[PDB]
Amino acid sequence: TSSAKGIDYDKLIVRFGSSKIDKELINRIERATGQRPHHFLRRGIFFSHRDMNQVLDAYENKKPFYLYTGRGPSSEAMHVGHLIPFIFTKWLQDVFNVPLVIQMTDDEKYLWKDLTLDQAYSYAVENAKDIIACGFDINKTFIFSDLDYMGMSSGFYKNVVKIQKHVTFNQVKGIFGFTDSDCIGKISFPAIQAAPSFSNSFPQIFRDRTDIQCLIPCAIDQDPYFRMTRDVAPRIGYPKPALLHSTFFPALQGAQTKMSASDPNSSIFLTDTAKQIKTKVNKHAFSGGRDTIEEHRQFGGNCDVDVSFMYLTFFLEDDDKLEQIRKDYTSGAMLTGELKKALIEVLQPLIAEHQARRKEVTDEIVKEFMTPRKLSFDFQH
Amino acid sequence: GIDYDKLIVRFGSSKIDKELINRIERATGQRPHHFLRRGIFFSHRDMNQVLDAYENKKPFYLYTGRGPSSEAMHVGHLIPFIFTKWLQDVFNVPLVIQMTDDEKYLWKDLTLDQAYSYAVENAKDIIACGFDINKTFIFSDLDYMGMSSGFYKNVVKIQKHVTFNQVKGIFGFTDSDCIGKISFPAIQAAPSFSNSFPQIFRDRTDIQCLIPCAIDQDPYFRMTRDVAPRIGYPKPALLHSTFFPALQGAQTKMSASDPNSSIFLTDTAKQIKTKVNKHAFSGGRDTIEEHRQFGGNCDVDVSFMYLTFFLEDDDKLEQIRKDYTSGAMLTGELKKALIEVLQPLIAEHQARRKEVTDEIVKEFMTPRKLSFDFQHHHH
Numbered sequence: 001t002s003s004a005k006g007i008d009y010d011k012l013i014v015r016f017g018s019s020k021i022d023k024e025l026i027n028r029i030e031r032a033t034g035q036r037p038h039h040f041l042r043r044g045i046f047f048s049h050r051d052m053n054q055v056l057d058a059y060e061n062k063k064p065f066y067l068y069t070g071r072g073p074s075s076e077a078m079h080v081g082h083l084i085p086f087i088f089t090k091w092l093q094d095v096f097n098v099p100l101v102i103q104m105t106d107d108e109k110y111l112w113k114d115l116t117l118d119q120a121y122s123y124a125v126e127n128a129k130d131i132i133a134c135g136f137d138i139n140k141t142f143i144f145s146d147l148d149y150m151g152m153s154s155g156f157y158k159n160v161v162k163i164q165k166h167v168t169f170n171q172v173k174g175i176f177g178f179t180d181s182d183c184i185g186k187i188s189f190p191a192i193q194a195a196p197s198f199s200n201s202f203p204q205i206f207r208d209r210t211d212i213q214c215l216i217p218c219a220i221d222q223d224p225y226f227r228m229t230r231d232v233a234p235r236i237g238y239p240k241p242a243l244l245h246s247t248f249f250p251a252l253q254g255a256q257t258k259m260s261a262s263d264p265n266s267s268i269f270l271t272d273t274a275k276q277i278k279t280k281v282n283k284h285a286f287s288g289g290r291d292t293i294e295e296h297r298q299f300g301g302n303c304d305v306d307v308s309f310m311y312l313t314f315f316l317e318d319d320d321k322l323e324q325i326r327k328d329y330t331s332g333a334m335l336t337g338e339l340k341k342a343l344i345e346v347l348q349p350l351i352a353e354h355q356a357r358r359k360e361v362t363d364e365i366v367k368e369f370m371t372p373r374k375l376s377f378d379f380q381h
Numbered sequence: 382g383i384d385y386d387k388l389i390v391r392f393g394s395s396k397i398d399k400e401l402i403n404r405i406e407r408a409t410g411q412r413p414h415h416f417l418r419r420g421i422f423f424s425h426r427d428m429n430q431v432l433d434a435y436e437n438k439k440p441f442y443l444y445t446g447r448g449p450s451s452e453a454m455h456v457g458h459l460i461p462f463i464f465t466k467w468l469q470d471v472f473n474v475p476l477v478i479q480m481t482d483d484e485k486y487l488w489k490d491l492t493l494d495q496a497y498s499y500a501v502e503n504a505k506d507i508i509a510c511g512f513d514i515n516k517t518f519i520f521s522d523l524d525y526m527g528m529s530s531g532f533y534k535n536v537v538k539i540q541k542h543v544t545f546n547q548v549k550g551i552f553g554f555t556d557s558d559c560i561g562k563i564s565f566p567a568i569q570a571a572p573s574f575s576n577s578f579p580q581i582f583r584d585r586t587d588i589q590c591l592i593p594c595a596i597d598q599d600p601y602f603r604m605t606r607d608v609a610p611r612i613g614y615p616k617p618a619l620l621h622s623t624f625f626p627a628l629q630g631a632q633t634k635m636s637a638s639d640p641n642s643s644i645f646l647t648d649t650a651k652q653i654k655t656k657v658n659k660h661a662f663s664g665g666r667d668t669i670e671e672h673r674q675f676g677g678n679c680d681v682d683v684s685f686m687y688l689t690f691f692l693e694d695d696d697k698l699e700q701i702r703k704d705y706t707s708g709a710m711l712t713g714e715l716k717k718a719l720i721e722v723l724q725p726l727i728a729e730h731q732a733r734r735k736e737v738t739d740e741i742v743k744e745f746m747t748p749r750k751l752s753f754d755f756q757h758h759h760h
């Protein structure tokens with residue numbers, strides 16, 4: 001919350017009622033897939049879950065399940081922090097090889113921000129290109145805009161209504177903190193976000209089928225929506241969706257805040273130039289190192305609060321190379337200046353690569369991803 | 382019953398006077414409908430705008446709806462539809478009829494399927510009133526919301542401009558109601574704007590809307606009129622109807638959940654006769670002597686009120702009003718008259734409802750272009 005080393009996610013798990021992703025669960029995931037678990041799991045980035053056990057049972061018993069995650073398109077400007085969940089979702093889809101549903105809440109943002117319907121919709125379609133740039137299989141993923149899809153689904157709105165009937169205003173005032181002063185749109189929005197947790201909201205993909213297990217990978221701050229969804233699921237004859245939580249991507253200023261596009265000073269946008277990335281890291285990445293280089297060589301740095309090192313934790317694939325850096329920074333063998341330099345050498349190509357991928361997705365490609373249709377996945381209807 | 386003059390002032394609407402009725406006559410070339418001549422449709426909002434438009438040859442459309450609470454519809458439910466069908470013929474305009482299955486699902490102990498099915502059934506009776514299938518689109522919220530490129534978009538726009546406080550004070554909602562109810566008002570509001578029916582008005586957003594309804598639906602539209610400007614749409618005009626009397630009296634409340642509360646559209650010749658005689662509150666005197674001397678009271682006699690809604694011939698209605706008030710006519714003879722009017726009415730409606738085939742209902746509920754052409758150009 002205010003700790004320089006970030007939030008206490010063990011306390012968070014507790015006051016959230018979720019369960020920790022332990023060694024046991026990570027080994028099971030490895031066993032079930034025969035693949036080495038993604039570094040987000042190995043390193044505690046995706047630290048919490050809800051019913052991942054069930055998802056695994058289903059997967060091992062050849063039962064089907066699908067992925068569902070989303071994005072609030074509040075702007076054309078996305079940052080590196082926004083990529084975490086998507087990066088992991090793309091891994092989950094390749095590893096388990098299941099269909100994916102990605103909700104673009106353009107209506108949410110229209111409701112909450114000073115935006116035009118076309119703006120909101122435009123940001124959804126633009127952000128979709130960035131999501132497509134993460135590598136999702138065009139034949140296994142449906143990226144939809146709430147504004148468009150609501151009007152071209154024989155089952156989506158039906159579920160929204162079912163959910164709306166089972167969630168009182170008091171409940172959402174408690175869960176999300178709404179007040180008598182908010183517009184009725186905001187008050188009923190949670191149902192829109194919950195609805196995609198149920199397979200029959202996507203007839204063109206699951207056609208009336210209502211049992212497919214849903215797995216929702218998302219940043220921990222989205223949990224309240226699905227904590228609510230899980231309570232209503234049984235009440236309306238549907239299965240509870242499973243969750244896989246991720247920690248907040250640290251703001252440049254320090255781990256006590258998540259990177260927020262609101263404050264561009266804390267973000268590294270996917271549209272920043274190599275130069276801008278370098279100067280943002282060098283000038284703004286909070287350092288766990290010592291004040292003078294002499295003191296650094298003598299006492300060493302503190303990785304637990306160093307933002308530059310935390311970023312490496314998310315983007316440096318190689319486990320061994322990261323460890324050297326950790327040890328060398330801690331022993332003072334590596335100066336924060338060199339740590340910084342190392343991070344910049346990881347992000348510049350990360351972001352430049354992403355821009356290259358994004359430039360590749362043409363109007364025709366986006367349109368297809370956003371067209372409801374069968375996802376070359378056969379279900380025992 | 383209720384003093385509708387004090388209602389007009391409270392609600393801040395306008396009384397339908399003779400000028401307005403004469404104007405409607407001139408604009409339509411028809412004799413104004415008896416509901417109009419007899420004050421059944423007594424209040425309005427902007428009806429003059431609608432007339433200015435029609436006179437200047439601009440277009441306008443009709444919007445009304447039905448809450449499918451049950452498969453059981455009674456004579457009082459037809460009032461706004463009988464009138465609306467008249468307005469459609471007389472002005473010759475496209476009509477949109479909203480079946481709020483979602484509202485009933487939210488408010489009642491029903492399943493989505495039931496609410497929906499009730500909407501389809503009720504739609505049969507609505508079609509039985511004789512609406513032109515080339516000029517009217519009847520839709521289920523549950524279905525249309527899911528296949529319209531403009532309906533949901535308008536709901537969201539409306540939802541952004543109405544706070545919980547607002548609907549709390551208007552509909553009396555509480556922190557305890559479900560979130561579906563808190564936002565439903567926006568759904569009843571949406572069809573007030575033409576671009577909610579892109580298929581029928583070719584994406585026009587400036588088409589004048591006329592909403593004929595029972596005075597108790599006004600709140601939904603006072604709200605709608607309030608937001609219309611805030612989202613660049615013209616506000617809808619209204620024509621209010623009085624409450625239909627409950628058999629037990631113009632004081633008590635009626636319901637589809639009370640077979641003797643009114644005369645249901647499925648009743649037999651015998652049941653109609655039985656109901657009127659046994660349950661129609663009488664404005665007659667306690668004894669025949671008092672009746673002959675001081676006469677009956679038509680202002681509290683439910684049977685007479687009924688005749689006011691269904692007896693077409695003005696002169697005969699007056700002869701009965703006169704004879705009952707003079708005591709010349711006993712309440713038993715009055716009852717007799719009402720029954721001769723109601724039996725053929727329900728009988729005929731039941732006959733036309735049987736002519737409503739599943740494909741007819743489907744065509745009516747199928748979003749499509751109606752037999753009207755609207756142009757919209759922009760480069």
Ligand SMILES: N[C@@H](Cc1c[nH]c2ccccc12)C(=O)O
Pocket residue numbers: 068069070071072103105108193216217218219222
């Ligand atoms: N509401 C989230 C986006 C979202 C919608 N559905 C989701 C499911 C999983 C994760 C995120 C989402 C936001 O504002 O960012």
Ligand SMILES: N[C@@H](Cc1c[nH]c2ccccc12)C(=O)O
Pocket residue numbers: 444445446447448479481484569592593594595598
């Ligand atoms: N809500 C009204 C039905 C309705 C919906 N839209 C309307 C428009 C005009 C008049 C009535 C309606 C009811 O419960 O009966």
